[PDB]
Curated annotation (Swiss-Prot):
Gene: HSP90AA1
Keywords on record: Acetylation, ATP-binding, Cell membrane, Chaperone, Cytoplasm, Host-virus interaction, Hydrolase, Membrane, Mitochondrion, Nucleotide-binding, Nucleus, Phosphoprotein, S-nitrosylation, Stress response, Ubl conjugation
Full-protein interval shown: 17 to 223 of 732
Outcome (variant: E31A): Strong ATP-binding. Strong interaction with HSF1, HIF1A, ERBB2, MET, KEAP1 and RHOBTB2. No effect on interaction with TSC1
Source organism of the structure: Homo sapiens
GO biological processes: activation of innate immune response; cardiac muscle cell apoptotic process; cellular response to heat; cellular response to virus; chaperone-mediated autophagy; chaperone-mediated protein complex assembly; mitochondrial transport; neurofibrillary tangle assembly
Location of the region described as Interaction with NR3C1 in the Swiss-Prot/TrEMBL record: 1-207
Positions of modified residues (N6-acetyllysine): K42, K68
Name under which the protein is recorded: Heat shock protein HSP 90-alpha
Record's comment describing the protein's domains: The TPR repeat-binding motif mediates interaction with TPR repeat-containing proteins like the co-chaperone STUB1.
Length: 207
């Protein structure tokens, strides 16, 4: 298990998300579904010039899986996935610029729901989760588990768990007061409200 420091700017963003009073927490789901959709668009387009990129799985979809026993909501996609370099180097580079812009927008009167416009919507997971675990597999790289409970550090390890083919699984370990996001009716309401035109099947699993 390797432990890494977030860039100061990203730690600052995470603290803002965790600490700011903001009741409209439900937007985390739209942000993660949007990320999944982008990842699916990316593998689909790449496969037009290299069909072998789908050898790791042809089906392009999103699953939402609540588990009341574990108190987790998992968002699974069969998108492009992330390499180790993405997790430790590349995504932090884009996150730095997006965070700066988002901060400027907030000072000028924007609100937290607009986070996705700045390309850093992933961190909205921390509106509802005390810990986020991400399992990811990109073609030609290993399966990794990324994890963070904020506090300025994240971990990465090679994942020896259930092989996933290709894609990303975001596992939200929900805060004690955010268990509404495990309820079928609530998730259905939110998907209908904010994610109705996503161009991939979204299957809401039941418990
Ligand atoms: C999903 O897990 C993680 C872990 C660390 C950082 C990010 C991240 C951060 C950003 F600022 C902007 C974008 C991302 C991710 C968001 C993402 N989600 C999904 N489902 N799939 C992919 C390929 C990505 C991706 O390419 N980038 N995402």
């Amino acid at each position: 298990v390797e432990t890494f420091a977030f860039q100061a700017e990203i730690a600052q963003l995470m603290s803002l998300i965790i600490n700011t009073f903001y009741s409209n927490k439900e937007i985390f789901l739209r942000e993660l579904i949007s990320n999944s959709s982008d990842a699916l668009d990316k593998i689909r387009y790449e496969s037009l010039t290299d069909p072998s990129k789908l050898d790791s799985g042809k089906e392009l979809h999103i699953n939402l899986i609540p588990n009341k026993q574990d108190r987790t909501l998992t968002i699974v996609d069969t998108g492009i996935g992330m390499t180790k370099a993405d997790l430790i180097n590349n995504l932090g580079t884009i996150a730095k610029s997006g965070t700066k812009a988002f901060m400027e927008a907030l000072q000028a009167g924007a609100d937290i729901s607009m986070i996705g416009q700045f390309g850093v919507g992933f961190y909205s997971a921390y509106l509802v989760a005390e810990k986020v675990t991400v399992i990811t597999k990109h073609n030609d790289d290993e399966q990794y588990a990324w994890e963070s409970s904020a506090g300025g550090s994240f971990t990465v390890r090679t994942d020896t768990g259930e092989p996933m083919g290709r894609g990303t699984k975001v596992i939200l370990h929900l805060k004690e007061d955010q268990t509404e996001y495990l309820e079928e009716r609530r998730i259905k309401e939110i998907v209908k409200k904010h994610s109705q035109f996503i161009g991939y099947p979204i299957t809401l699993f039941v418990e």
